[PDB]
Symmetry: T
Amino acid sequence: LIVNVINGPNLGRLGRREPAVYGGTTHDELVALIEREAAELGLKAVVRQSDSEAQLLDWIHQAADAAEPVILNAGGLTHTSVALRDACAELSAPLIEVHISNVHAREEFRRHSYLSPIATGVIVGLGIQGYLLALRYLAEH
Amino acid sequence: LIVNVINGPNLGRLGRREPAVYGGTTHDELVALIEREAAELGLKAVVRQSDSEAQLLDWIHQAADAAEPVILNAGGLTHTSVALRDACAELSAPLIEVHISNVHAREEFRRHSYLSPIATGVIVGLGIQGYLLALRYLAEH
Amino acid sequence: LIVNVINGPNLGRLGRREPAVYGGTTHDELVALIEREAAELGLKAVVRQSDSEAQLLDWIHQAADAAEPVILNAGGLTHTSVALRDACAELSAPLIEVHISNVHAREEFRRHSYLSPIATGVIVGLGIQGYLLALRYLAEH
Amino acid sequence: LIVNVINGPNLGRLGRREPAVYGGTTHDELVALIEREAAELGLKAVVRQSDSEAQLLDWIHQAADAAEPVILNAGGLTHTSVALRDACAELSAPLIEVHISNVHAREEFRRHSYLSPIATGVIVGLGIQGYLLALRYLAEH
Amino acid sequence: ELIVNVINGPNLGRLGRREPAVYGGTTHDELVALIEREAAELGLKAVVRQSDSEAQLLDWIHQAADAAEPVILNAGGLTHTSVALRDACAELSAPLIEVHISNVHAREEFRRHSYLSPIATGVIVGLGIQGYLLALRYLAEHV
Amino acid sequence: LIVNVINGPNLGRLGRREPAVYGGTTHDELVALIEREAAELGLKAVVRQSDSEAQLLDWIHQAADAAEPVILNAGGLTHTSVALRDACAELSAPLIEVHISNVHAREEFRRHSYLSPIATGVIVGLGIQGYLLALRYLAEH
Amino acid sequence: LIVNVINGPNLGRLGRREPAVYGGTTHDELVALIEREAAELGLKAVVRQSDSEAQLLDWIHQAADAAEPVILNAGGLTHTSVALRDACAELSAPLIEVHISNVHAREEFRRHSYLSPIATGVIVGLGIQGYLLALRYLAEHV
Amino acid sequence: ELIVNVINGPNLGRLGRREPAVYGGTTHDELVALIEREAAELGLKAVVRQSDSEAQLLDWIHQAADAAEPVILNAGGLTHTSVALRDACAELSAPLIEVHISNVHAREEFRRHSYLSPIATGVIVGLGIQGYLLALRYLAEHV
Amino acid sequence: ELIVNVINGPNLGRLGRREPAVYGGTTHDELVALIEREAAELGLKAVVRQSDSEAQLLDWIHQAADAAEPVILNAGGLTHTSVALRDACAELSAPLIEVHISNVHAREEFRRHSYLSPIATGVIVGLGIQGYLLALRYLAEH
Amino acid sequence: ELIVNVINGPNLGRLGRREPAVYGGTTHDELVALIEREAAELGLKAVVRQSDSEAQLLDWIHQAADAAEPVILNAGGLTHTSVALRDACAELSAPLIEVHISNVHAREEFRRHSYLSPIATGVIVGLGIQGYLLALRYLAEHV
Amino acid sequence: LIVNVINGPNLGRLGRREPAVYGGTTHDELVALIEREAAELGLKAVVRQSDSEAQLLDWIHQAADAAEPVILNAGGLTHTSVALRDACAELSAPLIEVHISNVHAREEFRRHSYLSPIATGVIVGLGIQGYLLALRYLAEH
Amino acid sequence: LIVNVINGPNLGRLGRREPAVYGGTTHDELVALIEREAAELGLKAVVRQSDSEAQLLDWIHQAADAAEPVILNAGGLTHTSVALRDACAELSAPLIEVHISNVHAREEFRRHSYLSPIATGVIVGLGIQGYLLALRYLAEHV
Ligand SMILES: O=C1C=C(C(=O)O)CC(=O)N1
Ligand SMILES: O=C1C=C(C(=O)O)CC(=O)N1
Ligand SMILES: O=C1C=C(C(=O)O)CC(=O)N1
Ligand SMILES: O=C1C=C(C(=O)O)CC(=O)N1
Ligand SMILES: O=C1C=C(C(=O)O)CC(=O)N1
Ligand SMILES: O=C1C=C(C(=O)O)CC(=O)N1
Ligand SMILES: O=C1C=C(C(=O)O)CC(=O)N1
Ligand SMILES: O=C1C=C(C(=O)O)CC(=O)N1
Ligand SMILES: O=C1C=C(C(=O)O)CC(=O)N1
Ligand SMILES: O=C1C=C(C(=O)O)CC(=O)N1
Ligand SMILES: O=C1C=C(C(=O)O)CC(=O)N1
Ligand SMILES: O=C1C=C(C(=O)O)CC(=O)N1
Ligand SMILES: [Cl-]
Ligand SMILES: [Cl-]
Ligand SMILES: [Cl-]
Ligand SMILES: [Cl-]
Ligand SMILES: [Cl-]
Ligand SMILES: [Cl-]
Ligand SMILES: [Cl-]
Ligand SMILES: [Cl-]
Ligand SMILES: [Cl-]
Ligand SMILES: [Cl-]
Ligand SMILES: [Cl-]
Ligand SMILES: [Cl-]
Ligand SMILES: [Cl-]
Ligand SMILES: [Cl-]
Ligand SMILES: [Cl-]
Ligand SMILES: [Cl-]
Ligand SMILES: [Cl-]
Ligand SMILES: [Cl-]
Ligand SMILES: [Cl-]
C-alpha cells in the first residue's frame, strides 16, 4: 500500500529553480500529482522533502524498518553521499531512483550516481512524470 | 501517433538469454505487450529488432524523417557505437533509452552510454515494463 | 543594498584553528571588519556561519529569492558539495567565492572547487581581506 | 582520563543493519562494552552517535578545546567529508580511526579515507573489538 | 616610494578588441592608466608592464626578486604552461598576487590548473579589470 | 561432438594480410588444417568466417542453443564489441578465445579483450596452431 | 588511375543531417562533385557509401588487392572500429582520412581516431572540399 | 586580391636537413617559392613568415586579426604546448587552417593533442609540403 | 597450545636505528620479547620471525596455512608490491592481521594501496609497536 | 632430443590444496610427472622446476638463454610485478611460452597486465594444467 | 673537440636562486669552473645562458650544423618544451642532459623530461659537478 | 674512503644480455675498470652483484652501518622495489643511482624509479663510464 517518495536538497525549490532544466511545476503541485496518481493505482504515497542529509537518512531508515518501497530523488547528494547509499542498502523493498533532468546530458560529475548500483531501477530526464512512472512500476510489479 | 520501439543486438534472444539478468519474457511476448499497452494509450507502436548496426541506423533515419518518437534499447551497441549516436542526433521527436537490467549494478563499462547524453530520458532496471512506461511518457508528450 | 556573507564548516573556529594556515583573526573579528567595510562602501552586510550544509542551502535560497549578492566561503564543502553548487546556480546576483588560505598551495583535493565554475569570481589566499575585496567589487557592480 | 568515541551516519543502526558486513551487535550494546572496557583501563569513555555531519563537527571541536583523545568512526562520511577532516586537524590529543568492516575488502571508493592521513592510527576489520583495542592504545599513551 | 610591479603576459596588450565577451572592452592602455590612478590613491607607485615574450617577463620578475618588490601577475596563456615562469616567481620574497580577468574555472579544463597559483600569495579570478585594483588594495594593507 | 570455430573480421584475408604478423597460411588452408586435426581427435569442426558482426552473433546464438563449444577469433571486434561478449555469455559449453598474433606485443589497445573475462581460456601468439591446441583442450573437456 | 572514396555510417544522410555541423550539400551532389574534380585532374573516382561495417571492409579489401588509393570518411566508426583500422592496414597505396566537420572542435571522444595513425594524412574541418583536396594530393603525386 | 598569411613556427626554418625521414628534403626557401607560385595561380597574395620566437608568432597573428586576413599556421612544437598561441588565434575572424608536414598522429602520443585544432577552421596533417598548397586552395574557394 | 605466527618482512630487522622518527626506537630483539610476554599473559604462544627474503616469508606463510595457525603480518615494503605474498596469504583459513608500525596513509601515496589488506581479516596501522600486541588481543578474544 | 624448460614461480609448489576452485586439485608433483610423460611422447625432454625465489627463477632463465632452450613459464605472482624477470626472459632466443592455469582475465584487474606477455612468443591462459601440455605441443611443432 | 654547455631560463640566477635547492655557486663561478675542467681535459668548452627559448634553439641549431656535442640544462623548459626537444633531435653528436638539483625528489611535474628520451644520457642531482662530469664523459667518448 | 658499487638482477649478464642496449663490456671488465678508476682517485671500491633482493638489502644495511657511500644500479628492481628503497633510506652517506642504458628512451614503466627520489643523484645512459663518473663525484665531495 505505502510508497515513500523522498526528495533531497534543492527540490523544495521546484518551479522557480532553473525552469529550463527542471520545469515550472512546484513541489506542492508535485505532491498533489503524486497523491492523485497513487490513489488511481490503489496505492498510498507519502511525499517528503529535505535539504538535510540527516533527515533523509532518518526517513529511509523508517522505510527499511517498515519494508516499504522508496522513490528517491536525492538531488545533489546522489553524486556525493556514501552515507545515503549505506542507508539505502538496508531497504528490502524496491528502491527506484528518479531524476527530473537528463543527468547524463549535463556535467560529467552527474553521471556517476552512488545510488544507481544499489537501486532496483533508475528513471532520468522524463521530467515530473518520472515520479508517476516509478509509482506505476511499483503498483504493477 | 506512431511510436518506434527499436531493439538492438541479442534482444531477439530474450527469454532464454541470461534469465536472471533479463527475465523470462521473450521478444515475441514483448512485441505483444507493447502493442497492447499502446492501444490503451491511443498510440500505434512499431516494434522491431535487429542484430545489425546498419539496420538499426536505417530504422533511426526513418524515424528522423517522419519525426516519430523513438524508444531505443540498443543492447551492447549502447556502450560502443558512436555511429548509432550520430543517427539518433538527427531525431527531432523525443528519444527514450530503455534498458531491462540495471546497467549501473553490473560491469563498469556498462555505465557510460553513448546514447544517454542525447536522449530525452533513460529508463533502466525496471524490466520489460520500462518499455511500457516509456510509452506512457510519450502519450503525455 | 544587501550583501550576504556566508561562512561554512569550521570557519566559526577561526583564531585557534590552524593559525599558520588561516591566521589569528576570529570569526567575530571578521564579522566586525566586514560590517565596518560595508558601511564605508554604503552597503549593508549580513554575515552568517554554520557547520550545517542544509543551513547554508537555506541562506542561499533566501539570497536567491531576494536577488541579493553572495560572498561564500563554504570551507570543506567547497570541494565536496554538489548540493551547494546547485543552490548557488539559482542566484541571479553575483556570487563571489572567497578562501582565506591559498587553496592551491595545499593538498591536491583542494584545487577542484565545485563552486568556482558557477561563481562570478574567486578570491583565494589573501586572508580576511579577501572578504573586504569581494565587498568592494560588489559595491562597483 | 576522558576518551571521546564518536560514531557517524548509520552506526546507530547497528544490529539489523547489514548483519553479514557489520555484525549482530547493536549500538546500545557497543556503548556498554566500551564503557566497561574503559573502566577496566582506568578511563572514562563518552560514546556519541549522530547521522548529522554538523553534530559530529561540534563534538570534534569540543574535543579539540578540551585536548581529549578521539576514537572516530565517521561511517560513510569517512570517504567523502573534507569538512570532517578539517575539524579533526585541530585535535592535539591522538585521533584513532576505527572501522568495523574491512573497508579494503569492499568497494574501491571505501579504500581512500579522508581521515587516515591526519589520524594517529587506523584500526579496520577487527569488528566491534576495534573500538576496545583503540581504547587500550590510548591508555598506554 | 612603495613600488608595485604589475606584469601582464601574452595577448594582454590586445585587451579591448580581443574576445570582448570574455575579457571586457577596456583596452590595455586604459588598464595601465586605471592601475596608476588607483595605486597613487593608495599611496603606492604602480609600474605596469606587458610583454608577449616569456624571456622579457622572466627578466621583469627577476628584478622584482632582487628589489623585494610586490608583484601583481597576469601571465595570460603562460599561466597554464610555463614552469620557467613559476621557477622565477619562486624567488620573490615580497607578496605575489596572481590575477585573471576572466573566471578561468568557468572555461576550458586546461585553464583550471595554474602553475603559478601554488607559489603565489593569493589569486583573484573573474572579477574583471577590478581584480588588478583589488590586488593593489591588498598590498596597501600588507607592507 | 561438434566444435564451432568462428573467425571474425579480416580473418578471411589470411595469407596476404600482414604476413609478418599473421603468417602465410590462407583461410581455406586453415579450414583444412582444423578439419584434419578434428578428425584425428574424433571431433566434428565447423569453421566459419564473417566480417559481419550480426552474422557472428547469429552463429554464436546457434551454438548457445545447441550447447556446442566455441573457438572464437573475433579479430578487431575482440577489443570493441560488447554485443559479441553478450552473445558469448549465453554459451553453456566452453568458450576458448584464440589469436594468431601475440596481441600483448602490439598496440596497447589490443591488450584489453572484452571476451577474455568470460571465456574459459585464451590462446595468443601461437600462430595458426592456436586453433588446433584449442581443439585438443575441448576433446578432453 | 582509380581512386576509391569511401563514406561510412550516416554520410548518406548529408543535407538533412545536422546542417550546422556537416553543411547543406547532399551525398548525391558530393559524389558528382568528387567525380568531376577527379576527372579534371586526370583521375577516376569510385565513390561509395555504406552504413554497414562489413560492406566498408569489403571495399577496403578490394582496394588493397588492387593497390588503389583510398580517401576515407568512416564517420562514427573512425572513433570506434579496430576492425576497420585492421583492414586499412593492408593498404599500400596512399590512404587519406577525411572529415567534413572539425572533429577536434566537438566532443573529446571524437579526437582519438583509430585510422589517423595508419593513414598517410588527415584532412579535417574543410567541409566538402576536403575530399577534393585529398584528390589533388594524389594527382600531384603521380 | 586576397592576402593570406603563412606562418611557420620553431624549427621549420631548419627544413631540408631536419629529420628528412619525418619532414622531407624540401627547404624552407623552396617551400616559400612553392607557396608563392601556387598563390599566383589561385589569384591570391601569400606572405610566408617563419620564426623560432613565440612572441614573434603572436605579433604576426595579431596583425592578421587586425587586418582580418586568413592564416595558414604550422606552429611546430608550440602546437602541443602553447595556450598563448591558441589565445592569439582565437582573435582571428578570417579562417584559420592548421597545417602539419608530418602525420602527427603516427608519432609520439604527446603530438596528438593540438591546442590549436579546436579553434581552427580546419586541419591538414601528414600530406607533406603540399598541405600548405591545399590549404591555399581552400581559402581561394571560400574567402 | 594456540600458536600465533608474527611475521616481519624486509628492513624490520633494522628496527631501532632505522628512521627512529618514523618507526620508533625499539629494536627487533626488544619487540620479540614484548610480543612473547604479551602472548603469555593472553594464553597464547607467539612465534616471532623476521626475514628480508620474500621466498622465506612465503615458506612461513605456507607452514601457517597447513597448521591452520593465525598470522600477524608486517610485510614491510612488500606490502605495497608483492602479489606473490598476497597469493600465499590467500591460503590462510585462520585470521590474518596486517600490522604496520607507522601510519602508512600519512606517508607517500604508493604506501596507501596494500595488496594484503583486501584479503586480511583486519588491519592495524600507525599505533607503533603496540599494534602487534593489540592484534594478539584480537586473536585471544577470537 | 630437444630440451624444454618448464619453470614455475611462487606458490605453484602449493598446487592441490591451494585455492582448488581457482587452480584445480592437481598437485605440483602430479603436474611434474604429467609434463614429463607428455613431452617424452612428443620426442622432447622436459625439465620442470619450481621455486618461490625470484633469484632462483632468474638463474634458470639465464641457463636457458645460454643453452638456447625453449621456456614454458608460469611465474605466478611475479608475472604481474617483476621487471627483473622480464629482463631475464628478454635474453631468450628460443620460444618463450607464458602459461597460466586460471583465467587471469576473469580475476582481479591487477592480474590482467602481465610484464612477460609483451616479450613472450605466446600466452596460454585458463585451460588448467593442460595449458602446459599444449605449450609443449607447440614447441614440438616449431620447427 | 668543442663542447657546448647551454643553460636555459633562470640558470643565470644561480647563487641567490633557492640556495637550498640549487646550491650557492653562481653562474659566473660555474663558467670559471668549466674553463678549468676543459683545460684539464684538453678540450674547448663554450658556456652560454639564456632565458629565451628562441635563443636556445639557435644555439642548438649551430651545434647541429657543426656536429658539436651539447651539455644542456634547459631549466623549466625541460618539462614543457616540445620545440626544444625537436631542435635537439637534429644533433648528431652526443647530448648530455644535466640538472643541478635532484629533479625526482621534487614536484611530480619535474619527473617527465621531454629531453631525456632523445638525449644520450642524463645527470641529475650532483649539483654543479654534474656539468664537469658530463664534460669528462665527452672527453673520453 | 671505501665506496660500495652494488649491481642488481641481470647485471652479472653484462656483455651477453642485449648488447645493443647495455654494451659489450662484461661485469668482470666493469669490476676491473671501477677498481682502476678508484685507485686513481684515492678511493677503494667494493663491487658486488646479486640477482637476489635479500642479498642487496643486506649489503645496503652494511653500507648504512659503516656510513659508506653507495653507487647503486638495481636493474629491474629499480622500478618495482619499495623494500630496496626503504633500505636505502637508512644511508647517511651519499647514494648515487646509476643506469647503463638511457632508461628514459625505453618503455614507460622504466621512467618511474623508486630509488631516484631518495638518492643524492642519478646518472643514466652514459654506459659503463656512469659508474666511474659517480666515483669522481664522491671523491670530490670527500
Ligand atoms: O544532480 C541533480 C539532479 C536533479 C534531478 O534531475 O532531479 C536535481 C538536483 O537537485 N540535482
Ligand atoms: O548492456 C546491455 C543491456 C541490456 C538491457 O539491460 O536491456 C541488453 C543488452 O543486450 N546489453
Ligand atoms: O578547504 C578549506 C579552505 C578554507 C579557506 O581557505 O578559507 C577554509 C576551510 O575550512 N576549508
Ligand atoms: O564505509 C563504511 C564503513 C563502516 C565501518 O566499517 O565501520 C561503516 C559505515 O557506515 N560505512
Ligand atoms: O588563460 C588566460 C586567462 C586570461 C585572464 O583571464 O586574464 C588571459 C589570457 O590571456 N589567458
Ligand atoms: O587484434 C587482432 C588480432 C588478430 C589475431 O591475432 O588473430 C586478428 C585481428 O584481425 N585483429
Ligand atoms: O565523428 C563524425 C565526423 C563526421 C565528419 O565530420 O565527416 C561524420 C560522422 O558521421 N561522424
Ligand atoms: O610536432 C611537430 C610537427 C611538425 C609538422 O609535422 O609540421 C613540425 C614540428 O616542428 N613539430
Ligand atoms: O611501508 C612500510 C611500512 C612499515 C611499517 O609501518 O611497519 C615498515 C616497512 O618496512 N615498510
Ligand atoms: O596470478 C597468478 C596466476 C596463476 C595461474 O593462473 O597459474 C598462479 C599464481 O600463482 N598467480
Ligand atoms: O626544473 C628545473 C631544474 C633545474 C636544475 O635542477 O638544474 C633548474 C631549473 O631552472 N628548473
Ligand atoms: O631497467 C633496467 C636498467 C638497467 C641499466 O640501464 O643499467 C639494467 C637493468 O637490468 N634494468
Ligand atoms: Cl524538465
Ligand atoms: Cl531528442
Ligand atoms: Cl540512467
Ligand atoms: Cl530484469
Ligand atoms: Cl592567513
Ligand atoms: Cl593527532
Ligand atoms: Cl610570495
Ligand atoms: Cl582560484
Ligand atoms: Cl570581464
Ligand atoms: Cl604467425
Ligand atoms: Cl564459458
Ligand atoms: Cl587531424
Ligand atoms: Cl636486518
Ligand atoms: Cl583470513
Ligand atoms: Cl587501513
Ligand atoms: Cl622468444
Ligand atoms: Cl592472454
Ligand atoms: Cl643524441
Ligand atoms: Cl634521470
